[PDB]
Enzyme design. Structure first.
Site, mmCIF file in Angstrom:
data_model
loop_
_atom_site.group_PDB
_atom_site.id
_atom_site.type_symbol
_atom_site.label_atom_id
_atom_site.label_comp_id
_atom_site.label_asym_id
_atom_site.label_seq_id
_atom_site.Cartn_x
_atom_site.Cartn_y
_atom_site.Cartn_z
ATOM 1 N N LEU A 63 -2.825 -9.267 2.748
ATOM 2 C CA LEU A 63 -2.531 -7.838 2.607
ATOM 3 C C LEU A 63 -3.778 -6.957 2.768
ATOM 4 O O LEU A 63 -3.688 -5.830 3.237
ATOM 5 C CB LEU A 63 -1.845 -7.558 1.264
ATOM 6 C CG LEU A 63 -0.488 -8.236 1.040
ATOM 7 C CD1 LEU A 63 -0.003 -8.032 -0.388
ATOM 8 C CD2 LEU A 63 0.550 -7.720 2.020
ATOM 9 N N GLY A 64 -4.943 -7.471 2.385
ATOM 10 C CA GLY A 64 -6.188 -6.728 2.518
ATOM 11 C C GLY A 64 -7.333 -7.503 1.895
ATOM 12 O O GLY A 64 -7.112 -8.452 1.128
ATOM 13 N N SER A 65 -8.557 -7.119 2.240
ATOM 14 C CA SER A 65 -9.739 -7.733 1.653
ATOM 15 C C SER A 65 -10.870 -6.721 1.594
ATOM 16 O O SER A 65 -10.889 -5.765 2.355
ATOM 17 C CB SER A 65 -10.161 -8.998 2.421
ATOM 18 O OG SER A 65 -11.084 -8.703 3.457
ATOM 19 N N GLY A 79 -14.285 -5.288 -1.341
ATOM 20 C CA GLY A 79 -15.070 -5.418 -2.560
ATOM 21 C C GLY A 79 -14.302 -6.070 -3.698
ATOM 22 O O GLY A 79 -14.883 -6.772 -4.523
ATOM 23 N N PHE A 80 -12.989 -5.848 -3.725
ATOM 24 C CA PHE A 80 -12.110 -6.426 -4.746
ATOM 25 C C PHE A 80 -11.824 -7.917 -4.529
ATOM 26 O O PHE A 80 -11.460 -8.625 -5.469
ATOM 27 C CB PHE A 80 -10.782 -5.671 -4.763
ATOM 28 C CG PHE A 80 -10.120 -5.601 -3.415
ATOM 29 C CD1 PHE A 80 -9.228 -6.585 -3.014
ATOM 30 C CD2 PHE A 80 -10.416 -4.564 -2.538
ATOM 31 C CE1 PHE A 80 -8.628 -6.522 -1.765
ATOM 32 C CE2 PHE A 80 -9.826 -4.498 -1.287
ATOM 33 C CZ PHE A 80 -8.928 -5.481 -0.902
ATOM 34 N N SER A 101 -9.831 -10.906 -1.839
ATOM 35 C CA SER A 101 -8.795 -11.045 -0.809
ATOM 36 C C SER A 101 -7.433 -11.172 -1.463
ATOM 37 O O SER A 101 -7.241 -12.003 -2.354
ATOM 38 C CB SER A 101 -9.055 -12.264 0.072
ATOM 39 O OG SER A 101 -10.342 -12.210 0.649
ATOM 40 N N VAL A 102 -6.486 -10.352 -1.016
ATOM 41 C CA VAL A 102 -5.155 -10.331 -1.606
ATOM 42 C C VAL A 102 -4.097 -10.694 -0.581
ATOM 43 O O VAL A 102 -4.049 -10.105 0.501
ATOM 44 C CB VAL A 102 -4.819 -8.945 -2.205
ATOM 45 C CG1 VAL A 102 -3.413 -8.952 -2.797
ATOM 46 C CG2 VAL A 102 -5.847 -8.545 -3.245
ATOM 47 N N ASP A 141 0.991 1.536 0.402
ATOM 48 C CA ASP A 141 0.001 2.228 -0.418
ATOM 49 C C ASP A 141 -0.096 3.704 -0.064
ATOM 50 O O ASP A 141 0.321 4.124 1.022
ATOM 51 C CB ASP A 141 -1.366 1.517 -0.477
ATOM 52 C CG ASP A 141 -2.203 1.658 0.789
ATOM 53 O OD1 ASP A 141 -2.959 0.694 1.067
ATOM 54 O OD2 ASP A 141 -2.173 2.708 1.474
ATOM 55 N N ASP A 143 -11.519 3.535 -10.770
ATOM 56 C CA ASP A 143 -11.413 3.567 -9.322
ATOM 57 C C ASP A 143 -10.077 4.163 -8.879
ATOM 58 O O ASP A 143 -9.459 3.712 -7.920
ATOM 59 C CB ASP A 143 -11.631 2.159 -8.732
ATOM 60 C CG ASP A 143 -12.047 2.198 -7.263
ATOM 61 O OD1 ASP A 143 -12.466 3.287 -6.803
ATOM 62 O OD2 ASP A 143 -11.964 1.150 -6.578
HETATM 63 O O1 LIG Z 1 0.046 -5.793 -4.070
HETATM 64 C C1 LIG Z 1 -1.103 -5.444 -3.849
HETATM 65 N N1 LIG Z 1 -1.515 -4.766 -2.752
HETATM 66 C C2 LIG Z 1 -0.732 -4.311 -1.688
HETATM 67 C C3 LIG Z 1 0.616 -4.631 -1.551
HETATM 68 C C4 LIG Z 1 1.330 -4.102 -0.496
HETATM 69 C C5 LIG Z 1 0.718 -3.232 0.402
HETATM 70 F F1 LIG Z 1 1.438 -2.719 1.427
HETATM 71 C C6 LIG Z 1 -0.621 -2.888 0.253
HETATM 72 C C7 LIG Z 1 -1.341 -3.417 -0.801
HETATM 73 C C8 LIG Z 1 -2.149 -5.673 -4.831
HETATM 74 C C9 LIG Z 1 -2.008 -6.163 -6.144
HETATM 75 N N2 LIG Z 1 -3.195 -6.171 -6.704
HETATM 76 N N3 LIG Z 1 -4.142 -5.659 -5.810
HETATM 77 C C10 LIG Z 1 -5.485 -5.447 -5.925
HETATM 78 O O2 LIG Z 1 -6.125 -5.743 -7.074
HETATM 79 C C11 LIG Z 1 -6.167 -4.904 -4.875
HETATM 80 C C12 LIG Z 1 -5.482 -4.598 -3.694
HETATM 81 C C13 LIG Z 1 -6.274 -3.971 -2.571
HETATM 82 C C14 LIG Z 1 -5.512 -3.969 -1.247
HETATM 83 C C15 LIG Z 1 -6.356 -3.201 -0.226
HETATM 84 N N4 LIG Z 1 -6.452 -1.790 -0.637
HETATM 85 C C16 LIG Z 1 -7.197 -1.664 -1.902
HETATM 86 C C17 LIG Z 1 -6.520 -2.506 -2.994
HETATM 87 N N5 LIG Z 1 -4.176 -4.809 -3.611
HETATM 88 C C18 LIG Z 1 -3.503 -5.334 -4.643
#
Ligand SMILES: O=C(Nc1ccc(F)cc1)c1cnn2c(O)cc(C3CCNCC3)nc12
EC number: 2.7.11.1
Length: 274
Positions: free
Chosen positions: A12-14, A16-17, A19-20, A96, A135
């Site tokens: 879904l993204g990666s 500083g936090f 990789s999710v 988001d 944040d």
């Molecule tokens: O479900 C999550 N993210 C997500 C889910 C669907 C989507 F369509 C975009 C992002 C998620 C749960 N915890 N968490 C995090 O602790 C950080 C991020 C990052 C994803 C990239 N953007 C910044 C947050 N995403 C998530």
């Protein structure tokens, strides 16, 4: 194992936090998010009630993760040799707020009002549980597109809430207050309110108000889109240079611009269902 309990989906993204990934809980097909955080990248360490060395992020999530659905709930977690893996609830469909604003441009004020109110309720919840997010921004807010409900994510820059000064900060600089920029210190709630002002500006203008340190310190807000006088006032109030000049959460929610908010479901029906 965790590989057997969850089927891993797309990244879904990666950043500083960490990789999710999108995931599915195998037992019941629950949608989840699977977040990997490298041990070498964790500076804030916390202690569990049972006395375990764990990332602060985990401590904060558990303090916050009960019932109210304005914050993304931690379902489970695992320790690996070089990382921790967090299992989080995932709404579906979802987008988001950063992407939402990017696609749609500046939000109509009725929509901005509903979204902002929900963000305020979520942050208030965190503070009530003794957690400071640090944040708050569009990228850390998910929109449940069916229910019109917003969810606050990513507590990896967060801290236990306290009444004394913070002198560390690793959140997003363009959302950080002038006292942080100038003096490397801030107090939790008043810094949070500043970030909320940046967030609200972003919602109604389609972009953040300040880019450079000197712009943050000058704190002069210019509106690039048509925005109502009540809304401009509230924004400039959250973005007061002196922290003590900023509104309390109660004051924000009693502001005239904040009256008659739509319910989440009404919000989805009018603005999201399409
Ligand atoms: O479900 C999550 N993210 C997500 C889910 C669907 C989507 F369509 C975009 C992002 C998620 C749960 N915890 N968490 C995090 O602790 C950080 C991020 C990052 C994803 C990239 N953007 C910044 C947050 N995403 C998530």
């Amino acid at each position: 194992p965790l590989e057997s309990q969850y089927q891993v989906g797309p990244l879904l993204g990666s950043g500083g936090f960490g990789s999710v990934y999108s995931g599915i809980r195998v037992s019941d097909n629950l949608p989840v998010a699977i977040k990997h955080v490298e041990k070498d990248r964790i500076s804030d360490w916390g202690e569990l009630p049972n006395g375990t060395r764990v990332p602060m992020e985990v401590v904060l999530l558990k303090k916050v993760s009960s019932g109210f659905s304005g914050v993304i709930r931690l379902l489970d977690w695992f320790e690996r040799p070089d990382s921790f893996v967090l299992i989080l609830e995932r709404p579906e469909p979802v987008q988001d707020l950063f992407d939402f604003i990017t696609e749609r441009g500046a939000l109509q004020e009725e929509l901005a009002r509903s979204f902002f109110w929900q963000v305020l309720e979520a942050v208030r919840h965190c503070h009530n549980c003794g957690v400071l997010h640090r944040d708050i921004k569009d990228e850390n807010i998910l929109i449940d597109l069916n229910r019109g409900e917003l969810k606050l994510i990513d507590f990896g820059s967060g801290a236990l809430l306290k009444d004394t000064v913070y002198t560390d900060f690793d959140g997003t600089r363009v959302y950080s207050p002038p006292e942080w920029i100038r003096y490397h210190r801030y107090h939790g709630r008043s810094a949070a309110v500043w970030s909320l002002g940046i967030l609200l500006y972003d919602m109604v203008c389609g972009d953040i108000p300040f880019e450079h340190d000197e712009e943050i310190i000058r704190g002069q807000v210019f509106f690039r889109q048509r925005v109502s006088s009540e809304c401009q006032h509230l924004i400039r109030w959250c973005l007061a240079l002196r922290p003590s000049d900023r509104p309390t959460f109660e004051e924000i929610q009693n502001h005239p611009w904040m009256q008659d908010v739509l319910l989440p479901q009404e919000t989805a029906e009018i603005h999201l269902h399409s």
